[PDB]
A paper describes a structure:
Dye-decolorizing peroxidases (DyPs) are heme proteins with distinct structural properties and substrate specificities compared to classical peroxidases. Here, we demonstrate that [name] from the extremely radiation-resistant bacterium [name] is, like some other homologues, inactive at physiological pH. In contrast with the α-helix rich structures of the latter, DyPs are organized in two domains with a ferredoxin-like fold of four anti-parallel β-sheets surrounded by α-helices. A sequence analysis of DrDyP compared to four characterized and structurally determined members of the class V [name] family of DyPs, demonstrates that the proximal His heme ligand, and the four residues that are proposed to form the hydrogen peroxide binding pocket within this family of DyPs are conserved in DrDyP (H324, D189, R348, L373 and F375).
However, the so-called [name] fingerprint motif GXXDG has a substitution in the fifth position, containing a Methionine (M190) instead of a Glycine, as observed for the other DyPs. The proximity of this residue to the catalytic residue Asp189 made us suspect that it might affect the activity of the protein; we, thus, re-engineered a typical [name] distal site by generating the DrDyPM190G mutant for spectroscopic analysis. UV-vis and RR spectroscopies reveal that the resulting DrDyPM190G is also in a 6cLS spin state at pH 7.5, and thus the Methionine does not affect the activity of the protein. The E°′ of DrDyP and DrDyPM190G are found to be –81 ± 4 mV and −96 ± 7 mV, respectively, at pH 7.0, which we attribute to the 6cLS heme species, which is the major population present in the solution in both cases (cf. RR section). To gain more insight into the function of [name] from [name], both DrDyP and DrDyPM190G were crystallized and structurally determined to 2.20 and 1.53 Å resolution, respectively. DrDyP possesses one and DrDyPM190G possesses two molecules in the asymmetric unit, respectively. Each molecule of the DrDyPM190G (residue 15–460) contains one heme molecule, one calcium (Ca), one Cl, one hydroxyl (OH), and 632 waters. The high-resolution structure of DrDyPM190G, obtained at pH 8.5, shows that one hydroxyl group and one water molecule are within hydrogen bonding distance to the heme and the catalytic Asparagine and Arginine. This strong ligand most likely prevents the binding of the H2O2 substrate, reinforcing questions about physiological substrates of this and other DyPs, and about the possible events that can trigger the removal of the hydroxyl group conferring catalytic activity to DrDyP. Here, we suggest that the presence of the hydroxyl group and the water molecule at the distal side of the heme iron can explain the hexacoordinated low-spin (6cLS) state of the heme of DrDyP, and thus the lack of activity of DrDyP at physiological pH.
Residue numbers in the entry: 16 to 460
The structure:
């Protein structure tokens, strides 16, 4: 490590601190506890296989993450006093909080894929791996322990990764910008700072306001845990490709530059702030360069539009309406693309029905609050950036009359006619407990 360690890394789950591998392979599995006894036995069987964040900066070929819903803790027999100490948003669950998320219309929970939104997801298991061999080793273990456990049911399994050049379902490099955590042991990459106080991401530690956020009780249940918003999206890549072709007239006929303007980065990962006129793939793949900007040199969005995805999600130095503290609205993202590789040349309606997309694991000590805030305030409206009702082009709920403001000299351009290019298929609010908490849960009576 190269910075003072303040976190109990040996007790925090690996996924809280470990970056997604590149390349990456893995599996998401949703599990229901049919009995309390089955859920506890499953956790006991899995605990030796759930790695901590010890030396999270080092190479690790695979790890297995575990996160538990409100209905899963209830079913395990967590006492009512403990259940009551969780946030109300978590207890209600993601679908129940649809109004706070603007999960309406195409994203309404009524239309979600089973098992999401029904209370049946109790445990989400995620295997992350850097190579196929170690992915399969961890998968064999997890499936063996699941099969061996009476009283649990595998609801759904979906494999992810294996994408060409690790690109996501719209062909973008991702996993680039995540918060640095003061006390993790590792100094920020250039532009990744400022390091955020640890309590914003790990319960039991002081946050930006100097005190620990509210946490579950007793201490062995809440300390060194965190919250997760898990969201699965389907990607409509045919409609996205057709949109780029039909609106590239607004970016000199260059469809890849329009792709860069909508997200804020070229698909290579190069941010427009550091590559405003042509792509720079080498820069895009280099973590010591690809995040080293703050928008101070782009107050008007002539490089990165103020309503582009990344500038919405992390405004950095942008002048917003109302002096907002961005440090308390950060989120750790583990993004996992799934399904057939993105095809940049496929623009048919049938291409939209290819089963590809992304899962996100959004991690924070207040993941419910921050996911709701981002969804309601920075994705599905634009008051903070002074562009009215415009919604995020990549994950906002679109209709054809909503616009995307593309700053240009001498006059701005407003594109329109977007679809919702990434549609929510389901999600859950989950608790990612410490290793000590997992042991405690498995030993409830
Ligand atoms: C669902 C489809 C989505 C796609 C295809 C997508 C794609 C991307 C891409 C390409 C990047 C830039 C590379 C990187 O920094 O990793 C990015 C960044 C980011 N996205 Fe998304 N994203 C999606 C949804 C979301 C949602 C729902 C949220 C939060 C509620 C979100 C939050 C962020 C954040 C915080 C960043 C980093 C911004 C920064 O620090 O500069 N994304 N996303
Ligand atoms: Ca359409
Ligand atoms: Cl990551
Ligand atoms: O992403
Ligand atoms: O993202």
């Amino acid at each position: 490590h190269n910075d003072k360690i303040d976190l109990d890394l040996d007790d925090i789950q690996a996924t809280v601190l470990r970056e997604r591998p590149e390349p990456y392979y893995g599996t998401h599995a949703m599990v229901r506890f049919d009995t309390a006894e089955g859920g506890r036995e499953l956790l006991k069987r899995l605990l030796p296989h759930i790695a901590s964040a010890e030396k999270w900066w080092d190479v690790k070929y695979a790890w297995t993450a575990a996160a538990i819903s409100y209905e899963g803790l209830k079913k395990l027999g967590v006492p009512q006093d403990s259940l009551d100490s969780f946030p109300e948003s978590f207890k209600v669950g993601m679908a129940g909080r649809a109004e706070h998320l603007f999960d309406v219309g195409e994203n309404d929970p009524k239309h979600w894929e089973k098992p999401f939104g029904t209370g049946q997801v109790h445990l989400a298991l995620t295997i992350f791996a850097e190579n196929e061999e170690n992915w399969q080793k961890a998968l064999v273990i997890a499936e063996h322990e699941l099969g061996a456990t009476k009283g649990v049911t595998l609801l759904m399994r979906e494999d992810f990764g294996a994408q060409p050049d690790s690109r996501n379902s719209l062909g973008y490099k991702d996993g680039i910008s995540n918060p640095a955590i003061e006390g993790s042991g590792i100094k920020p990459f250039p532009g990744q700072g400022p390091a955020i106080k640890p309590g914003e991401f790990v319960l039991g530690y002081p946050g930006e306001a100097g005190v620990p956020l509210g946490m579950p009780k007793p201490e062995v249940l809440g300390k060194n845990g965190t919250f997760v918003a898990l969201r699965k999206y389907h990607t409509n890549a045919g409609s996205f490709n057709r949109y780029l072709k039909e609106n590239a007239e607004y970016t000199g006929g260059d469809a890849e530059l329009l792709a860069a303007k909508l997200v804020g980065r070229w698909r290579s990962g190069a941010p427009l702030t550091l590559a405003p006129k042509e792509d720079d793939p080498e820069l895009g793949h280099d973590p010591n360069r690809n995040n080293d900007f703050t928008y101070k040199n782009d107050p008007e969005g002539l490089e990165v539009p103020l309503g582009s995805h990344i500038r919405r999600m992390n405004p950095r130095d942008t002048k917003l309406e109302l002096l907002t503290d961005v440090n308390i609205h950060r989120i750790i993202r583990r993004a996992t693309a799934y399904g057939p590789a993105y095809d940049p040349k496929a623009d048919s309606l049938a291409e939209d029905k290819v089963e590809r997309g992304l899962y996100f694991i959004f991690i924070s000590a207040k993941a419910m609050d921050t996911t709701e805030f981002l969804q309601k305030e920075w994705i599905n409206k634009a008051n903070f950036i002074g562009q009215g009702s415009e919604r995020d082009p990549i994950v906002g709920l679109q209709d054809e009359d909503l616009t995307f403001t593309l700053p240009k000299e001498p006059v701005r351009q407003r594109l329109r006619g977007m679809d919702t290019f990434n549609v929510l298929r389901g999600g859950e609010y989950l608790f990612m407990p410490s290793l000590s908490a997992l042991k405690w849960l498995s030993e409830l009576k």
